[PDB]
Amino acid sequence: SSQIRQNYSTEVEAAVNRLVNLYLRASYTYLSLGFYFDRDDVALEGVCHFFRELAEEKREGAERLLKMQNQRGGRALFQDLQKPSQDEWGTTLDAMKAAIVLEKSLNQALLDLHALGSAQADPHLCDFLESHFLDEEVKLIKKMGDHLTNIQRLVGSQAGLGEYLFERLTLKH
Amino acid sequence: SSQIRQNYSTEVEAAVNRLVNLYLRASYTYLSLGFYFDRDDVALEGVCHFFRELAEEKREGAERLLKMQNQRGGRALFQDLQKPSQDEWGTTLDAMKAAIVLEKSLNQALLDLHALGSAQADPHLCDFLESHFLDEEVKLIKKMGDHLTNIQRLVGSQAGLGEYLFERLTLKH
Amino acid sequence: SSQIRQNYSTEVEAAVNRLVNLYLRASYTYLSLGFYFDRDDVALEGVCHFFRELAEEKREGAERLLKMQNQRGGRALFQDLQKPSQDEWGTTLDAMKAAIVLEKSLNQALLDLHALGSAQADPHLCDFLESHFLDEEVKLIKKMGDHLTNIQRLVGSQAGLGEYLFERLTLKH
Amino acid sequence: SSQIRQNYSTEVEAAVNRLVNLYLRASYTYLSLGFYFDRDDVALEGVCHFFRELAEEKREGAERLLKMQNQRGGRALFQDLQKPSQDEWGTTLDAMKAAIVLEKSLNQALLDLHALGSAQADPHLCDFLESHFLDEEVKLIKKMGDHLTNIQRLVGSQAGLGEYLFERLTLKH
Ligand SMILES: [Cl-]
Ligand SMILES: [Cl-]
Ligand SMILES: [Cl-]
Ligand SMILES: [Cl-]
Ligand SMILES: [Cl-]
Ligand SMILES: [Cl-]
Ligand SMILES: [Cl-]
Ligand SMILES: [Cl-]
Ligand SMILES: [Cl-]
Ligand SMILES: [Cl-]
Ligand SMILES: [Cl-]
Ligand SMILES: [Cl-]
Ligand SMILES: [Cl-]
Ligand SMILES: [Cl-]
Ligand SMILES: [Cl-]
Ligand SMILES: [Cl-]
Secondary structure (H helix, E strand, C coil): CCCCCCCCCHHHHHHHHHHHHHHHHHHHHHHHHHHHHCCCCCCCHHHHHHHHHHHHHHHHHHHHHHHHHHHHCCCCCCCCECCCCCCCCCCHHHHHHHHHHHHHHHHHHHHHHHHHHHHCCCHHHHHHHHHHHHHHHHHHHHHHHHHHHHHHHHHHHCHHHHHHHHHHHCCCC | CCCCCCCCCHHHHHHHHHHHHHHHHHHHHHHHHHHHHCCCCCCCHHHHHHHHHHHHHHHHHHHHHHHHHHHHCCCCCCCCCCCCCCCCCCCHHHHHHHHHHHHHHHHHHHHHHHHHHHHCCCHHHHHHHHHHHHHHHHHHHHHHHHHHHHHHHHHHHCHHHHHHHHHHHCCCC | CCCCCCCCCHHHHHHHHHHHHHHHHHHHHHHHHHHHHCCCCCCCHHHHHHHHHHHHHHHHHHHHHHHHHHHHCCCCCCCCECCCCCCCCCCHHHHHHHHHHHHHHHHHHHHHHHHHHHHCCCHHHHHHHHHHHHHHHHHHHHHHHHHHHHHHHHHHHCHHHHHHHHHHHCCCC | CCCCCCCCCHHHHHHHHHHHHHHHHHHHHHHHHHHHHCCCCCCCHHHHHHHHHHHHHHHHHHHHHHHHHHHHCCCCCCCCCCCCCCCCCCCHHHHHHHHHHHHHHHHHHHHHHHHHHHHCCCHHHHHHHHHHHHHHHHHHHHHHHHHHHHHHHHHHHCHHHHHHHHHHHCCCC
16 A cells, blocks of 8 residues: 555555544534534533533544554545434433443444454554543443433433533533 | 714614613613512522623613714713613513513614614624624523523422522522 | 524525535545645645644634524534545645635635625624634635745746645744 | 563563564664764765664663563573664665665564464563554654655655755754
């Protein structure tokens, strides 16, 4: 491919491009989740901020993958970005469940790429994912699960009241 | 009218005087809303502060209109100020709905003056309203709508509890 | 649509959603332009930084449109994001010409939305575009044109040499 | 071997000693490259500094390997250091190509040691190489490739002029 490319399979190169597309899709999903909670008829500004911050983190993930692709001598290829799965996201409970599902899918794609790298004997790819993605995803998913449990505990008691309290007393605003 | 007056119609001059009267009326309404929430039998001090601050903003709006009237070479004319529409304002929900209606009426008067200025080819009037009124009104109305949604969410759960929480955890105090 | 919506046409609401999609498309295009110049076989890091910064500005444009859509009581709707028009962008000259074409298309969409707002008598939309988009686009397009002229002057003399010099002595790095 | 040695194969111990010899050889090569560019008849002081800094980094690599060898309870063994492959290194283009070849050979030796560690089930060796060598080598090789492209772009235009410009405007001096 390149003067610099060394030990970098076409299979990993393509899988990295696909991972960029997944991260950018996830970023777009979080942009939609954030602006839904800014609606005047939803108006949970801590929830909007929580998802806007995730939008930024997923775009920064994609950018780190793209930097690595060029450092390896691979070639970035972009594809269309599919729109998010919903236009309206329901309650904070519904939204957090959607978010966990999303992150679990990202985490499965990271694990699938790690396994490809291991099959291709590409230790720099495995190190990169271990250094910058896999621990961050486990930590995020635990935080989301904690939030889900707290929202569940709250909305089981009194849904509107509970959703307000969660936004006010757990989420940053 | 004046050594300085230029491109400033009698129709806009009169409409500006009427707008001053509307802004001062709105200021008076917010003074009544604020002191109602300071009643010992209502006692929502964040709500009182929210409306007292709006009272001040509407009087500052009127004063900016008056400064502009004199900068254009128009003549300020004051009329009686009608008392606010209610003597007691109900719950925080009722009060916020009254406030949104009030602001929407101010915003319609601004839009009507903008349209007059455009019909009279008065771009300094249009710039002035765009610079100092129209965006501020859209922003305020969105904030009020956000508050309304949060109060609704709260009082649908448990009215007294919800009203206390909103005052404590959304409004500044 | 909403408790707050006032003077906000369905035609402008839809056109704003389309403008968000154009700005996000442009952001994606600039992401591809930036990472192309980071290729080891292209390696113009000031050019990469110039387009990455534009990527960020166009995503911030989209986010400002989305905030305004919610402030007006419109509803954000997202569509698929088409991939950029090229996978490889040629020389700095070719890339800057692509970028000017892109910005001129954004500027035409802004002008078309301004004209719709004027036809719908929506002065808050016109103020918003005048305050935050139209001057910034004219300024950017002039800068790009200046760059284009300098690159042309350089590559007409000695293409590789000239492209290096432009990157080193005009672009930030 | 030792009171402390645990899970540390003789095969990895020997391969580490060989890697020390390769890193010290590379350090010596970069010392020769640096002083060649300090010749009065070559006189590219940014190029001299670039290779002297690499000389230092490769000796620090060797020293880190030696510290790890002792931390594992292996025994350092030193062999003769072969002289660099050339006495005169040509142009900056020629020198950077020599340097990339050198670094690719170091990177292949690191990958070969990683594979040995994986075959021997030595995760501390794999972690050590991933923490301190493999990412640094990928980053260095990308930088060198970027430099190579820029030098090529320059010397294709006007060789002496281009080499001066690269030294002056890319390399630190
Ligand atoms: Cl392959
Ligand atoms: Cl396509
Ligand atoms: Cl690993
Ligand atoms: Cl806020
Ligand atoms: Cl007149
Ligand atoms: Cl009277
Ligand atoms: Cl105007
Ligand atoms: Cl107090
Ligand atoms: Cl309509
Ligand atoms: Cl679709
Ligand atoms: Cl305007
Ligand atoms: Cl840099
Ligand atoms: Cl052994
Ligand atoms: Cl010997
Ligand atoms: Cl490892
Ligand atoms: Cl010196």
